[PDB]
Design a protein around this nucleic acid. Structure first.
Ligand code: MG
Ligand code: MG
Ligand code: MG
Ligand code: MG
Ligand code: MG
Ligand code: MG
Ligand code: MG
Ligand code: MG
Ligand code: MG
Ligand code: MG
Ligand code: MG
Ligand code: MG
Ligand code: MG
Ligand code: MG
Ligand code: MG
Ligand code: MG
Ligand code: MG
Ligand code: MG
Ligand code: MG
Ligand code: MG
Ligand code: MG
Ligand code: MG
Ligand code: MG
Ligand code: MG
Ligand code: MG
Ligand code: MG
Ligand code: MG
Ligand code: MG
Ligand code: MG
Ligand code: MG
Ligand code: MG
Ligand code: MG
Ligand code: MG
Ligand code: MG
Ligand code: MG
Ligand code: MG
Ligand code: MG
Ligand code: MG
Ligand code: MG
Lengths: 150, 125, 199
RNA sequence: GACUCUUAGCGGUGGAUCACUCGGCUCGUGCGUCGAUGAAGAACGCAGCUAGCUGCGAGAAUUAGUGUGAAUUGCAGGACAGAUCAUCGACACUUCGAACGCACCUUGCGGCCCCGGGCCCGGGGCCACGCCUGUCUGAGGGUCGCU
RNA sequence: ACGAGUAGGAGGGCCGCCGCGGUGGGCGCGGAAGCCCCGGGCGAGGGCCCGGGUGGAGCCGCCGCGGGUGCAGAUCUUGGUGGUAGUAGCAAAUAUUCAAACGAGAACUUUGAAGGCCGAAGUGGAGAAGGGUUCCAUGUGAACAGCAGUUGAACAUGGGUCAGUCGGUCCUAAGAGAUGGGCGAGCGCCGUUCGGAAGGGCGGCCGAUCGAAAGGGA
RNA sequence: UGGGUAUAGGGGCGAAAGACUAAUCGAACCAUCUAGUAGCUGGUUCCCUCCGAAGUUUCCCUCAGGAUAGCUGGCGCUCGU
RNA sequence: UCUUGAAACACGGACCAAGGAGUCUAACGCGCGCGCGAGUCGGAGGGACGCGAAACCCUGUGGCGCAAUGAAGGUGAGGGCCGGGGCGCCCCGGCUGAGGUGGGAUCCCGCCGCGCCGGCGGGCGCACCACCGGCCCGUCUCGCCCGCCCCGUCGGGGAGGUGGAGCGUGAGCGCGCGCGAUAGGACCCGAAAGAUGGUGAAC
RNA sequence: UCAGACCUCAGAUCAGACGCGGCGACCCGCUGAAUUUAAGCAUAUUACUAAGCGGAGGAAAAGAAACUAACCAGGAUUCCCCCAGUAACGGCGAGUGAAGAGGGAAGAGCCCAGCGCCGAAUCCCCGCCCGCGGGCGCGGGACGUGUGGCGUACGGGAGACCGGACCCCCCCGGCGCGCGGGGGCCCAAGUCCUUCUGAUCGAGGCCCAGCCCGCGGACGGUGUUAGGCCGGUGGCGGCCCCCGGCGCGGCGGGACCCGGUCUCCUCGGAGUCGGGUUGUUUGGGAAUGCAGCCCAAAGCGGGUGGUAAACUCCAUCUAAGGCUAAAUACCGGCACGAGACCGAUAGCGGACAAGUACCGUAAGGGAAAGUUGAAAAGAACUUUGAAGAGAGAGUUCAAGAGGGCGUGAAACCGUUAAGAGGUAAACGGGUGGGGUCCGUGCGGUCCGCCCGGAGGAUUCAACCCGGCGGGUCCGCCGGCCGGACCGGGCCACUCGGCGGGACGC
């Protein structure tokens, strides 16, 4: 489900920088052509140079997607459903089921015709599953990192 | 949640569209809630701020119960000036302190031909 | 460059291949685009089926596939003539016409003639003007039970019929299958060299 | 104890680090529209106070129309009672540029028509090349006819 | 029982960094991240926890997941700062001195006087090319003018270039360059007479046009 | 000697020095091909535990390099014990 | 850091901060993990229907395996026991479904010394390995039988050597992880050059 | 020809149109390298690539078979999958490399010339007249050196006969009548209580349902961290003004007879195919395509049939004329949505007056540079100095935020505090001294269980009693549930290269 990310192809290479060769007491790195600019005489291509090209620029044709066998994809569901029937695994997951009627919580099909949130909120209060919703409210916080800018 | 593909949830797009909003859009953004007496009289919750409107500051340092009339609506700064909400500079001259419209409640509306037309549309729906 | 036991590989990356690399990141959006286009095309031809005209049953050419059948381009003009359908009227009622296809046998000829006579039995021809029907137009009672057909018209299926079990005769037991094949190859290989000796 | 060395506090130099982000990159989607009716680009000019940016064209920091409905704001002002903004179907849109009277390192040099003023001055409209159809004026015993 | 190790291989990490799915009814203006510490510690180590100070809004543990994930070197890149060092230096073309004025302030400005230099192939008076407001007046003394400056070609605010007869404009010089024609896949190129080339008043011209602020030119 | 013109890069120009052709000339300058290639130099970033070398064989327009055998490590496995 | 040898009169390093070098895609091999298993995988497309460009479902065309071998025409992988018969050296019937020798984890039995524990006595022997048969394809030598509607330059089989990446009651396939050798800028930085197009006679 | 016509060729600032340049990501036609690989290098490769030139469009191009195949036959083009790193090519070295079939996306087919029938039956222009089209001209032309209708290889035409059409259909305009966009104005609920803060968006609370709304708990702004303050979000939500379609009706103007049999008649593209040769290209190899030159066709012909050639058989198509949507491509542009991406030495060169400053004669080269505070509240006033620059005062939560101002590391430097100092300084190991801190001497420096004794306080304990609860994962029960389980009935059942079998309800 993830989108491809890649650095531009022209990053660090849209400049005509030629190495000064040896004999100039410089480090044999491609330097920018001369001028009345502070950019003149600076490395432009190597990854160690400021404003250059990163090492191995990320390509968009990276293999983002993985294919799984249908038999294994169905296997994992049969195991995740079987694990949703054990009280120890649901509590160890963190859900608040210490007061629900039965661990496999089957309700009548009348709840499939609900049309208001207050009806669904009341159903969770009757099934004693509202303590898990309040636990979601207690977990509503702010992410730590650059995800906030994304 | 937001399901329309025509509306954006990007923080940068919503912040850019806010700080670069035109004047007629900043008017809608710089709205303020009506008082309990006005929200029940006109059945309108909030109205865009107006010059001759009287408001009460509900948040900040200048909050209280003193009803003050707005003296300037500075849409370029996203802030309004009230007749008594002010402070004295170093040289003694007084200067108004900017208060955000969402921090004041409208106690009296400058009702003209255009103000009553908006109160009728907002209450009709 | 080589090492212990391995495979001599042939990497075809001696050109500027990175300049021409087509990624399929628009494949899911392409699946929605074609799905949406079929829904718009279905509303265009509302009573008519969404797949289009009728394709005939054709035999695949090569020995690798001459046992199965598939859907051809259009019905031959000989099949249209045997089914009593004009070459130009057929395309108006959603019948694919292929003026190029031949009929070397009557098995494939009568295969589509039956398929072409069966499709016209399922046709519900609306009148050109709804206020005045004509001879070829279906009755108003039949025009009500007329819905848009989804999928290909008359899907081509090859239901295998069982060969009836029978007691093996002595002629079938005495038939030399291996000898009849080796001698068939010799008689087909030495056919020309024996035809000269006869002159 | 001057100097020197180490450590620490504080103060400098310097800018790291962290936090911030109206930016970039990548992916996806829908459109996919320039120009002799003067394009792209360029020049110059335009604001009460205005250099750059940006927006405009002598109607020049915008006009009209329409929507919106009290601001713009650095400051002054009364223009301003439909303010302001957005939109944009009206109008306008200097010079150079395919650039088109001839030229251009020149605000150079012309021609035609019409109008106004006193041949001169001013204004307006025109004068590139290639080519299509038609028109008009022609050309050559080129092929005929009539003399 | 055993314990060296370069090149190299392998495993372990409750070592560290960024981001994601989970999870801790986590943490935080009663103070997060970062930073400093002659503070207390822990681990063999990578590192980590706590305290104080500073800071002002985010941040972290655990199970998995994705890497642009760990620096002392590359005459690395960018930025900053040292010793050198208050050192080299402020030494080509003879030379200044006195008094006064303005001014907070004078070896350097201004006025006066004296002594000198350039000595008419000038250190004089005017142009061309180039520069483009450097020109002029007033004001500033902050940065610049490698000392200073009350001064300036600096800075700030205003002002200043007036033509029939000076030049451009006009003419062709070497040239350059269209038209016809030719070539060329093509942008185009070759070519300067070579084609029904006279737009005038009976016409000859033979080559449009451009090309001189030192040529020609009322 | 000024100005105006002419000749442009494998070309120009040269009373000839491989001189000169914008501080660049035994082949200018600019951008691209281009992150050209390099058996050749330089560098190559956290800790710990365990094992631990080779400069020798054969072949190679090889002899500053590879291929191969040896030495190394990892993964085991078949048994015994 | 290169080196047989560096504290070297060998090279780089004045100082601090940030940046800075084994990557990604394709394909191959082995090891490992997972799924199914003589199968295996939808990797095109189709269909259900904020995150959802996900997930779900269908589709096996096809790929890789299940058969190899020869240049090709082509051809193409069953062993053993029992009885009868032929006695040369390979016919028939029946019961079965991969043989024989040596080794072989494990299992089974007897006996003994104490329904357990040690002695030596056998047996069914996994996988694997050594060896010997057997069969398939190529090829060679020696050959005497056989088959038929298309009786011929026809097609079949035997015996004994030998070539093959074979058979001998399948093990692959999909996915992921790691390493190794590659081709791609390919760990990073570096040439002297070469090419295409263009700009300069203000020196 | 009342003497001029025609042909050919000119002129015009003639009447009315068109072409030019830009962009060029994708696309079409040409042109064309070398780095590089082959461990050298020359063919090869790089590559039918870059650079160079021309031409378009929203797509282009291609496209209705002179095809594939050898079958029991397929049937325009484009694209995807597969064929396949295969056939083949190649100093057969390095390397290169498709197609038929098969599965999908999308599917749409057509028009001429020629041939012969029709009184040129055809068309443009001007003027006038009607509602960009129409009539009108005894208007001017084009055209027989060939316009229009019919008609194109799937055959076609004509005449008969037969069966069906015939104000209908079909096409173009706009009217009645209901569905894709564009632009506007709106559309649910705390600023409740307590408390912290410079500022709440913090923390706690808000009768029984946990304050309220929730088809709205996306996001942003607001002086902190907000579903309920605000803009919005949600909603087959409302309203208003436009735009573009489609369906159903009628109105106006234009088209307009189709099929089936027989007979009769008719039927095709030339300096092109092809052969030779050359160069180039291709996997195409005694030549895949393309082109130059020479040769130069045929009409039971011609092309193809992946090895040159002759004879023969067979299959297949009908070249040398044209048009044509969809699936497809898109690094440019315009407008959007998104991110396991980057977070100011990073990400585009460019988060800023960035292709800017600046450099070069030019072609071109090309930076650095984001952050006061919540709010300028930006420090009045006093005083020293000529002034910068200070001292008070003042603003603010904070000046330890004072205009390149958030945080403010290191190198380096000033200064203070401590210690030390003639084998450059630093370093390991061991200890000593000093210093700064930390934890300790508080009525010192001991706890826990049990027991003995003392002292006072008990919802006072064992046992018994009635009901309750749990355990026996203790014996009798009884249900329920699962099947490689058994025997009987019944199903829209399903199921298989067999009404029965099997499966399950
Ligand atoms: Mg470049
Ligand atoms: Mg970069
Ligand atoms: Mg962080
Ligand atoms: Mg190796
Ligand atoms: Mg400091
Ligand atoms: Mg990262
Ligand atoms: Mg890195
Ligand atoms: Mg460093
Ligand atoms: Mg002056
Ligand atoms: Mg002055
Ligand atoms: Mg000075
Ligand atoms: Mg100045
Ligand atoms: Mg002139
Ligand atoms: Mg002169
Ligand atoms: Mg000269
Ligand atoms: Mg060149
Ligand atoms: Mg010499
Ligand atoms: Mg060790
Ligand atoms: Mg050795
Ligand atoms: Mg060496
Ligand atoms: Mg020495
Ligand atoms: Mg060295
Ligand atoms: Mg050094
Ligand atoms: Mg670093
Ligand atoms: Mg054995
Ligand atoms: Mg290997
Ligand atoms: Mg070369
Ligand atoms: Mg063009
Ligand atoms: Mg080479
Ligand atoms: Mg090499
Ligand atoms: Mg190109
Ligand atoms: Mg399209
Ligand atoms: Mg086209
Ligand atoms: Mg090739
Ligand atoms: Mg919020
Ligand atoms: Mg609201
Ligand atoms: Mg080639
Ligand atoms: Mg695009
Ligand atoms: Mg940057």
């Amino acid at each position: 489900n993830r989108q491809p990310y890649a650095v531009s192809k022209l990053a660090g290479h849209q400049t005509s920088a030629e190495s000064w060769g040896t004999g100039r007491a410089v480090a044999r790195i491609p330097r920018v052509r001369g001028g009345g600019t502070h950019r003149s005489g600076q490395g432009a291509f190597g990854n160690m140079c400021r404003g250059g090209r990163m090492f191995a620029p990320t390509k968009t044709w990276r293999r983002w997607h993985r294919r799984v066998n249908t038999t294994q994809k169905r296997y994992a569901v049969c195991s995740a459903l079987a694990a949703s029937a054990l009280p120890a695994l649901i509590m160890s997951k963190g859900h608040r089921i210490e007061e629900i009627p039965e661990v496999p919580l089957v309700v009548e099909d009348k709840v499939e015709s609900y049309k208001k949130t207050k009806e669904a909120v009341l159903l969770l209060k009757k099934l004693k599953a509202w303590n898990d919703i309040k636990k979601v409210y207690a977990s509503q916080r702010m992410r730590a990192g650059k995800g906030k800018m994304r | 949640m937001k399901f329309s593909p025509f509306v954006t949830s990007d923080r940068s797009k919503n912040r850019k569209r806010h700080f670069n909003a035109p004047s007629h859009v900043r008017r809608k953004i710089m709205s303020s809630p009506l008082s309990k007496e006005l929200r029940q009289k006109y059945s309108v919750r909030s109205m865009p701020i107006r010059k001759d409107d009287e408001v009460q500051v509900v948040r900040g340092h200048y909050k209280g119960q003193q009803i003050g009339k707005v003296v300037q609506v500075y849409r370029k700064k996203y802030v309004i000036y009230i007749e008594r909400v002010q402070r004295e500079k170093a040289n003694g001259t007084t200067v108004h302190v900017g208060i955000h419209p969402s921090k004041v409640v409208i106690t009296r509306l400058k009702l003209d031909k255009d103000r009553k037309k908006i109160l009728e549309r907002k209450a009709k729906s | 460059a080589p090492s212990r036991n391995g495979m001599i590989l042939k990497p075809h990356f001696h050109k500027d291949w990175q300049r021409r690399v087509t990624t399929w990141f628009n494949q899911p959006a392409r699946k929605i685009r074609r799905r949406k286009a079929r829904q718009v095309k279905a509303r265009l031809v509302a009573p008519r089926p969404v797949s289009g005209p009728v394709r005939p049953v054709v035999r695949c050419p090569t020995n690798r596939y001459h046992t199965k059948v598939r859907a051809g381009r259009g019905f031959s003009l000989e099949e249209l003539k045997a089914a009593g359908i004009n070459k130009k009227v057929a395309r108006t009622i959603g019948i694919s016409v292929d003026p190029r296809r031949r009929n070397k046998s009557t098995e494939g000829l009568q295969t589509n003639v039956q398929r072409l006579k069966e499709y016209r039995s399922k046709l519900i021809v609306f009148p050109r003007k709804p206020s005045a029907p004509k001879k070829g137009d279906s009755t108003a009672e039949e025009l009500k039970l007329a819905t848009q057909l989804k999928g290909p018209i008359m899907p081509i299926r090859s239901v295998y019929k069982k060969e009836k079990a029978r007691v093996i005769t002595e002629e079938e037991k005495n038939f030399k299958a291996f000898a009849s094949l080796r001698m068939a190859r010799a008689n087909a290989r030495l056919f020309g060299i024996r035809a000269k000796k006869a002159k």
